[PDB]
Amino acid sequence: MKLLVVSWGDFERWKETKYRFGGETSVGPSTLPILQKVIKPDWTVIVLSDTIGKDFSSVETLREDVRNRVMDFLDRIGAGREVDVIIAPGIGEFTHGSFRGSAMDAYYYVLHALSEIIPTKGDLEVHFDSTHGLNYVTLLTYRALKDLLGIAAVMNTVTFYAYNSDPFVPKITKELNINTIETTMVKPTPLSEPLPGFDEYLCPYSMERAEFVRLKGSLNTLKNLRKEKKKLEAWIGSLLFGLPLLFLEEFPDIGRLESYIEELAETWGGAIAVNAEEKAVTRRLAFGSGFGTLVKLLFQARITRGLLVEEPYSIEKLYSVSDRLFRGSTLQRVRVELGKIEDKAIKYARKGAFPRDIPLRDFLGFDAANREVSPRNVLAHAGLEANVVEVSMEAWEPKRPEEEAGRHTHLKYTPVGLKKVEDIVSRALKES
Amino acid sequence: MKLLVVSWGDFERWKETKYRFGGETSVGPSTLPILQKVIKPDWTVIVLSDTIGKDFSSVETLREDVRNRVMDFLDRIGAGREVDVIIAPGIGEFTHGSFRGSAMDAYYYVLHALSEIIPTKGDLEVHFDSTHGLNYVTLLTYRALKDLLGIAAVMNTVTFYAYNSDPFVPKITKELNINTIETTMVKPTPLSEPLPGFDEYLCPYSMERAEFVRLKGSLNTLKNLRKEKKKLEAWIGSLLFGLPLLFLEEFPDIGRLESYIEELAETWGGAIAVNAEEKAVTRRLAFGSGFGTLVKLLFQARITRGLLVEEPYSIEKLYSVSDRLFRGSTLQRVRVELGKIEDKAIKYARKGAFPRDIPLRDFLGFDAANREVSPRNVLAHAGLEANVVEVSMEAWEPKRPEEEAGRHTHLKYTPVGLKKVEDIVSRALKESH
Amino acid sequence: MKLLVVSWGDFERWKETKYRFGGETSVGPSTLPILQKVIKPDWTVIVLSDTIGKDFSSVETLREDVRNRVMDFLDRIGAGREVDVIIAPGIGEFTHGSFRGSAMDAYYYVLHALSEIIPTKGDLEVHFDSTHGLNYVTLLTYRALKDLLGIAAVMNTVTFYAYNSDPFVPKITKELNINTIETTMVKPTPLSEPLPGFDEYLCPYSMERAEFVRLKGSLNTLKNLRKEKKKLEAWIGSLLFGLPLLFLEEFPDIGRLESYIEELAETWGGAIAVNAEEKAVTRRLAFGSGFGTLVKLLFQARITRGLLVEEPYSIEKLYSVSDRLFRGSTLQRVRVELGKIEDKAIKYARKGAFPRDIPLRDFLGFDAANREVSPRNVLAHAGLEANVVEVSMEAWEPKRPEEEAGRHTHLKYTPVGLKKVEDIVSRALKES
Amino acid sequence: MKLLVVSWGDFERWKETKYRFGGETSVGPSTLPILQKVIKPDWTVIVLSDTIGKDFSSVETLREDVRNRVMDFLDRIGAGREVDVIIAPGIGEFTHGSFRGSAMDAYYYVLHALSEIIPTKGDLEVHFDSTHGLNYVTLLTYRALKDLLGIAAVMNTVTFYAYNSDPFVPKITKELNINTIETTMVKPTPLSEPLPGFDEYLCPYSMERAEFVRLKGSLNTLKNLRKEKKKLEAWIGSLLFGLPLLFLEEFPDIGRLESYIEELAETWGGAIAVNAEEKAVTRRLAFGSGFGTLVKLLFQARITRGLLVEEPYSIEKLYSVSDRLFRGSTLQRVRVELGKIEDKAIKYARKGAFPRDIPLRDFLGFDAANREVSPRNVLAHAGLEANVVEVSMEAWEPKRPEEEAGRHTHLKYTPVGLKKVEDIVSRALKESH
RNA sequence: AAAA
RNA sequence: AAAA
């Protein structure tokens, strides 16, 4: 699929001009139609500062004000149906009002909005126009885009293109070129940051330090995370470090993560105080880095949900998951470890032995030394450490064992072992 | 070490105002003086456009014009003179002149300038102002900065803050708060690009086919790089895939890399046509990604040169190299692979034995089943595959061999083994792109 | 997406040989593993005669028995898990049982199974091995394939390869070459056949002619088609005759067709009577031409479902639909008819005129007494006949009307006119 | 006119059994005699494989060997002798002989043979028995039979029946029913392939690269075709796109097509080497797609030759040509386009005017805006584009012009216009394939 | 500093 | 007539 994203400031103040792009031309106030004409995008996203709001009756008339005029202006140069408009929280003192809050709220808001727009199935061709963007909103939208596409690139080929028109000078300008300023094949970057201390999800901007602790206490999300924090970090680490069995057993609940974000998003919006008489907007809650981590964590889950196979987790299903999830030397380490356990399984099968609920140490044949679950041996052996993994071969009549053993040999962690891996992997994500 | 980077438009056009930042308060036309009082940087870096220039009798009269205008403005404001100015090649048609060329030239030019300014030793605390910038110079300066910092973070701690000012309103503005819009523990990202085809170092923006063919053909770079592509790619992959022995053996000649980058940067600069009468700059060559890859490659080599040593490579030295370069599960598999070779060394030492120039397979005592060198085995075993490595224990009277064999056990690739690995790692680096 | 279709008789009776294919070499009793080696198919299909079945307890133990034996034969040569298996209704009097019914049942059964396997999105590379096939099963599978790929080819590029190994002769054969006997780029062939009379969907093979009229009466499919027979034929004609507006207005309800085909495929299979003691299957119903026409009709709907827009239908969309749907002179007729109406809308626009709900004849400016709607003018003017079409120009403040007019000028058929066009097109489909 | 085609393998290995067909019952080894009793065909065709041959002293001894065996088997059984035996080039190593060559040859040889047996005048009811056939000869014969009947269906009604018998089981079988596995109205499909590049008429299977190029260079066909290629594609386009004027002015020389096919056939055959001692056949040449395209191009010419007439072409003639060749919405546009010019010729006639050698643009009443000949306007207006057609009104005393103007208004392409159309239609056929 |  |  093809996606086009553009950073806009104040669109009603631009001038009619002609643009050249991809051996084609167009005449109007915006770059959008000629971009839409060449790229033929399957979807188009517009990111504005909500700073343009004229009527402050309250938050919903502001987001209505802006959307109305974007919809009017989008008719005025035929920008089509297939459009989303991300009306972001910008700040400062202006002609027709005043907005206040954390400057980083836009990053987290644009990140949350794009995480709900960017296709999670299939390949991506992303197009970005920095022409007409506010300097800080363009830079935050650029970062937010690249952060999620980095996570998409794990499962899919992602090519990114960015455009900036030649500078418009109102006196000399005949025609402005749409230059390609960047064209890159996005590199796979799985989420590599742990969930933070419970301060960093929502922070107070200008809300009294006693009122905050009241509302933080009241939230469901934060207390449900206190529980799940370690298992989520265990899953994040599973992609980072090449732990295919931990990836499956720790797969997060997408609908529950959806809930956490919704509650934090509407909580952040429910602390936006609008004074109609001072034409003043104060966003009393600031988004925290942990809101960013959760958005990315959920996005990463959607991208990889296709791999969550039915139990029991066989050697064959684990090869299959690994081939998609891992690259470079990590993939090759995982193929070797599964190789050992498979090659042994094939030995057992030719002797008519089908061990059920047998320790991986006893399955591979280990002398009773060490038996301590080291960070070293968990991370070094694709999380398939011998003191934490139960093995079972569903008994069957073999004709081609070198083929079958992959299907009939299943791995799961022991309940004790899983808590040791969870602790080890969580801890490794924090020394990062 | 703190570094302050500011992205700057047409500075002579900015209005006087007040700035709030870090409990401090400032009056001026620019954010630079207050950022320097608060952040107290060890070096300031101003990045801005060619397109400010107004004298067109040459390129060196266009740059010395802009440099002198910046210096004169730095005095007008309470700004220091511990500053590097990067005059980036911009594009468009202006009232005072015309600049034509590749848009992407700015990125590669700034990437080149920053690569020689950003410290290669010690930790970095990088501060970036995007208040005054041209959206397209700012984005490219941002992109360029982060790309190098990601390489800097392989060896050192790199934290990154960006700042942008409240938007200025011609006569609604009393004071602008300089807001913090980003703070980042920069993650390690070793170079993951292979070196590209020989079309992609310089390209003709506006040059006759035949004339460009003569230039391309005259470059010592595209000649030396044709034979040396494989070895440089093998080294790139050594960091990426966790191969500490290959890291040392393939360690690039920094001199030869400087030569290549200088030559290409000269050729590009020398092809800048400035027409005095009609006031129009044409950059007849454009920088390719090949140039970008080399700038980063050299930077990665500069960043990691503190680890290189002479040809005897001890399992102890491999352990120490490995803990600097590698992280997560890459480091731990390396430690395990070095563990099983060190342990075998300790078994040999107690028996009073010290083999020399012995295939690692015969040292570990493998079957004769498989001698074919697979990508699987090379990458899976931190590049220390039994069929390509030659072990040499240097005889010593043992007494605590558990803590000693490390220093006296030396690893090396056989000449045949090194070519087999070079091909595997180079092909591996091109299939993961 | 690559696709391998192999036609099999009695796999248990083939002898172990070696095969040469694409410089590669392989040993064993079937062409299938070397075929999957060289072609690397994304999916594989196996078409068998169910006349190899042995256990006659009921229908679902024959397909079970057959499926198990196939699944074991694959397990024994290495064919992987990426395999659908079409067990097709054959006939004849065999060693281990007897099978009676319509021989053409095999055609429609395979057509129906292939219509739910062949991708209905993107290009196709199709590989067909005719080596080990029953003679009439291979000839019917080959036809059902080409007939569907012909419809797939309307929207996407479809290359077709056919292979046959050198004849096996059990005494002298060292190695058999796998010869390519056909290599074709499938030409686009829209459904060109009308829906028949209500006799020709299911027919009695061995059902007394009174018990039949009983079941035909109860089928919902036949009672619904009676209404929609003309709407569906109007649509079939729309692709055949180059009528872009009628393609959108008459686009079939896909869920509604899906259900018609399932009622007829479970009715046909409801009337398969096994006699476990006599070991004699009798398929008391036989699929008719009407079933086949519905399968091709549904497949063509799927292949082209991506073009369906939301009303109203602009000139711009009718250009877009047409570029995808139509080729040769038929496209250029459509582009000229949309050209005239667009150029008229430009003239109206430049004068600040924007007529709504106006007859096309009045919009274009026609003399009277030519209100008779003829098959000639409907087909000759891409279904955009002056007395059956209404034009609406949505009012906009023009700037470059040569660009704008395309988006703001919308066409629909009047409710009177649509019926005239439906009648005309349906009739034109029957004279074919 | 009825036609019975049957795919046979080795007919001397068939058992005896009972056959049910058309109410009747028959005893013997072949389904053929009962197929002839019931269907009562005008002509019968037997397609069988080369591989049945046993005498290897020559290639005509091998075909005279095979034919004899067939004729004698047509006596053992109560069959007719009013028959055609297409002896197709088979492939495989057998107990009695070894045959080598392209497997695809048999399609082209059968397509060729059928092109000269299928009647090219009046309707066709075609019957095909796949009971006794080799799986690959049956598919190729079916494909080749459909390919030809599709071109035949342009001009006449073509219904197709295909039969196959209940599977024969050694000792379980008593009576085998002959099942109708297909009954079709063969849809009209005019040739829609352009003539290919000159790689793809004859290719070397087992011919030394040199020996082939001497042969290829000795061929008249390739030389004559390179120069007639475009005008043949123009004609192929005329039927496909509905251009009735172009169809007449580009109607091929059937004699030169007959010529091209025989030279290629006799070359393909004259390069079959047959070694008598080691009983080996090698067809060192292989037929290409281009040979197939010519066999169909000629067949289409034969099928549509009924319509051609001398150089003056009238609007009445163009109506009747169009009525026979074209269908659906293509026919109706041709009628509407011929309707315009005719309706205008009647306005001219009532005034007593009869223009000669006048451009269609000046005849209809056009501006000077666009004289440029577009693919769009050529294909959309049935090839009767305004800047390439010249109308001549043959002066007559009108008395009911609305019935007469048809016979007395003639259309011709201008020398410059015809080349502009040939180019357009030729290239249009190449983009659509 | 909401196309330097 | 279940790789003539």
Side-chain angles (χ1 to χ4, degrees), chain A residues 91 93-94 103-104 133 135 142-143 164 166-167 169 180-181 187 192 241 329 332-333 376 379-380 432, chain B residues 91 93-94 104 130 133 135-136 139 142-143 166-167 169 179 181-182 187 192 241 327 329 332-333 376:
Chain A
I91 64 160
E93 318 303 325
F94 294 77
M104 257 176 289
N135 212 332
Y142 178 78
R143 171 148 70 92
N164 191 63
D166 292 352
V169 41
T180 296
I181 66 158
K187 294 156 189 184
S192 75
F241 303 138
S329 66
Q332 295 306 326
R333 292 199 287 275
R376 201 180 75 127
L379 294 175
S432 60
Chain B
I91 250 82
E93 273 86 65
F94 304 92
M104 273 177 267
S130 75
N135 259 316
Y136 107 98
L139 255 180
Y142 183 85
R143 178 152 86 83
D166 304 315
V169 199
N179 319 291
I181 56 163
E182 180 183 346
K187 301 299 304 197
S192 50
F241 304 137
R327 313 162 54 75
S329 61
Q332 298 304 332
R333 176 61 88 125
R376 183 168 144 143

Side-chain angles (χ1 to χ4, degrees), chain D residues 139-412:
Chain D
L139 277 185
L140 294 198
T141 303
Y142 181 83
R143 184 151 84 79
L145 198 38
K146 283 310 194 74
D147 282 339
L148 292 182
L149 292 182
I151 299 162
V154 170
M155 278 284 281
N156 306 106
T157 313
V158 182
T159 52
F160 178 89
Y161 307 77
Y163 308 103
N164 188 106
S165 91
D166 292 340
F168 172 93
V169 196
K171 285 229 66 182
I172 290 74
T173 291
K174 290 155 191 176
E175 62 186 29
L176 295 181
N177 200 20
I178 285 180
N179 328 306
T180 308
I181 55 161
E182 190 188 336
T183 62
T184 290
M185 301 292 308
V186 174
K187 300 301 305 200
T189 57
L191 188 53
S192 68
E193 327 175 340
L195 286 163
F198 298 82
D199 322 57
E200 314 190 70
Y201 294 89
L202 288 170
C203 320
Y205 181 75
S206 176
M207 190 163 265
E208 291 271 339
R209 192 214 53 73
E211 141 96 72
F212 169 45
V213 171
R214 185 205 54 78
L215 242 180
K216 191 176 187 268
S218 67
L219 291 168
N220 273 8
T221 293
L222 264 46
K223 278 190 258 269
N224 267 55
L225 209 68
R226 202 180 314 278
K227 209 76 87 198
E228 197 187 338
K229 182 172 200 295
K230 190 182 288 293
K231 279 183 181 270
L232 291 169
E233 295 181 334
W235 187 74
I236 291 157
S238 78
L239 276 96
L240 190 70
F241 299 140
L243 323 174
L245 189 58
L246 191 64
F247 160 88
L248 289 172
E249 281 206 17
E250 302 291 348
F251 198 100
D253 187 288
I254 287 169
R256 269 207 317 292
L257 294 173
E258 271 168 338
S259 167
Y260 295 140
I261 290 164
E262 196 223 284
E263 192 198 63
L264 289 176
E266 291 326 297
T267 306
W268 171 81
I272 302 165
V274 57
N275 291 319
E277 198 237 44
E278 64 272 41
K279 298 176 289 181
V281 180
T282 298
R283 314 198 192 81
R284 296 164 59 241
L285 285 187
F287 284 114
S289 64
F291 177 74
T293 309
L294 282 173
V295 158
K296 293 170 189 184
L297 174 45
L298 169 54
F299 189 70
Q300 188 159 287
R302 290 195 196 284
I303 281 286
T304 60
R305 85 179 301 164
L307 310 158
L308 182 70
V309 308
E310 267 182 322
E311 203 168 55
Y313 312 113
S314 82
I315 282 181
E316 186 194 45
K317 181 42 168 189
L318 286 168
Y319 266 119
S320 79
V321 165
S322 304
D323 262 61
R324 286 297 307 281
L325 292 172
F326 311 139
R327 317 166 41 72
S329 71
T330 303
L331 171 49
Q332 297 312 322
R333 179 59 96 120
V334 171
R335 288 193 71 74
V336 162
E337 276 298 325
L338 294 183
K340 266 166 224 307
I341 309 174
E342 189 183 38
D343 274 357
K344 177 59 97 264
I346 296 155
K347 174 182 196 169
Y348 271 85
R350 295 176 194 282
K351 284 187 175 91
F354 313 97
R356 252 166 211 72
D357 303 41
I358 188 174
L360 181 61
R361 58 173 296 90
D362 300 331
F363 185 87
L364 283 166
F366 272 32
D367 324 358
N370 211 43
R371 298 173 167 281
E372 290 180 354
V373 174
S374 55
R376 175 194 156 93
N377 294 337
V378 170
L379 297 171
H381 305 301
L384 303 179
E385 193 274 357
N387 312 285
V388 303
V389 177
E390 191 183 280
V391 191
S392 267
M393 294 211 70
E394 176 193 35
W396 83 112
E397 284 176 340
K399 61 139 189 153
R400 308 182 58 75
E402 63 260 7
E403 299 148 58
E404 280 145 3
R407 300 193 299 279
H408 299 117
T409 317
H410 304 278
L411 298 179
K412 182 181 180 179

Side-chain angles (χ1 to χ4, degrees), chain B residues 126-184:
Chain B
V126 187
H127 301 269
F128 181 64
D129 184 56
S130 75
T131 63
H132 292 305
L134 317 184
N135 259 316
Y136 107 98
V137 173
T138 287
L139 255 180
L140 289 183
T141 300
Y142 183 85
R143 178 152 86 83
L145 203 30
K146 289 289 211 68
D147 285 354
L148 291 165
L149 293 194
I151 298 175
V154 169
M155 286 283 280
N156 310 100
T157 303
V158 181
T159 88
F160 182 89
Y161 312 98
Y163 314 97
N164 192 101
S165 92
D166 304 315
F168 168 92
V169 199
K171 287 226 77 182
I172 291 64
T173 303
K174 271 154 206 186
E175 62 217 324
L176 308 154
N177 198 57
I178 292 172
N179 319 291
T180 305
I181 56 163
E182 180 183 346
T183 86
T184 301

Side-chain angles (χ1 to χ4, degrees), chain C residues 74-134:
Chain C
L74 298 174
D75 268 330
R76 156 162 126 63
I77 295 168
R81 293 175 67 184
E82 284 165 278
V83 162
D84 271 318
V85 178
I86 299 165
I87 315 146
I91 60 171
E93 315 285 328
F94 290 78
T95 40
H96 298 286
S98 164
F99 300 79
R100 301 153 184 207
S102 173
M104 277 177 284
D105 279 354
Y107 172 72
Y108 297 104
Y109 187 94
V110 170
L111 179 79
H112 166 50
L114 283 171
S115 64
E116 288 178 340
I117 288 161
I118 290 159
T120 65
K121 223 96 193 170
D123 309 301
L124 286 180
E125 207 186 78
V126 178
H127 298 266
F128 179 74
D129 173 43
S130 81
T131 42
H132 298 308
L134 297 204

Side-chain angles (χ1 to χ4, degrees), chain C residues 246-266:
Chain C
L246 186 69
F247 164 74
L248 299 181
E249 292 223 7
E250 303 287 359
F251 198 104
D253 188 8
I254 279 173
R256 180 160 275 277
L257 293 173
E258 272 172 356
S259 76
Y260 295 166
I261 288 158
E262 201 142 64
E263 184 159 54
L264 295 164
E266 79 184 26

Side-chain angles (χ1 to χ4, degrees), chain A residues 202-214:
Chain A
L202 297 163
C203 302
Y205 172 73
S206 73
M207 177 171 64
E208 291 184 355
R209 214 188 161 285
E211 184 182 349
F212 176 53
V213 179
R214 308 255 284 151

Side-chain angles (χ1 to χ4, degrees), chain A residues 280-340:
Chain A
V281 170
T282 300
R283 315 202 187 80
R284 309 212 295 115
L285 287 176
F287 280 121
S289 63
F291 176 79
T293 300
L294 276 166
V295 170
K296 293 170 185 168
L297 176 52
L298 164 60
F299 191 78
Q300 182 161 290
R302 291 194 196 286
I303 291 294
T304 69
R305 79 184 302 164
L307 299 172
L308 188 51
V309 289
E310 185 159 16
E311 59 164 12
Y313 307 130
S314 82
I315 294 290
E316 191 178 47
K317 291 164 156 189
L318 280 166
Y319 272 120
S320 174
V321 168
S322 302
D323 282 24
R324 289 303 308 277
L325 216 39
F326 310 125
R327 294 152 301 283
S329 66
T330 302
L331 171 51
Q332 295 306 326
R333 292 199 287 275
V334 176
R335 291 195 72 76
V336 174
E337 280 307 311
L338 297 164
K340 279 176 231 176

Side-chain angles (χ1 to χ4, degrees), chain A residues 328-330 332-333, chain B residues 233-251 318 321-322 325-326 330-331 333-334 337-338 375-385 413 421-422 424-426 428-429:
Chain A
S329 66
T330 302
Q332 295 306 326
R333 292 199 287 275
Chain B
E233 276 158 357
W235 185 74
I236 281 155
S238 85
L239 280 87
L240 203 63
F241 304 137
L243 325 174
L245 191 48
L246 194 64
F247 172 78
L248 293 166
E249 287 221 30
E250 303 288 70
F251 196 100
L318 289 172
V321 152
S322 294
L325 301 178
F326 307 137
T330 296
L331 176 56
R333 176 61 88 125
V334 169
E337 279 297 316
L338 292 181
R376 183 168 144 143
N377 292 321
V378 166
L379 295 173
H381 300 312
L384 303 175
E385 194 274 338
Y413 291 106
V421 168
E422 272 166 8
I424 283 168
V425 172
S426 188
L429 180 68

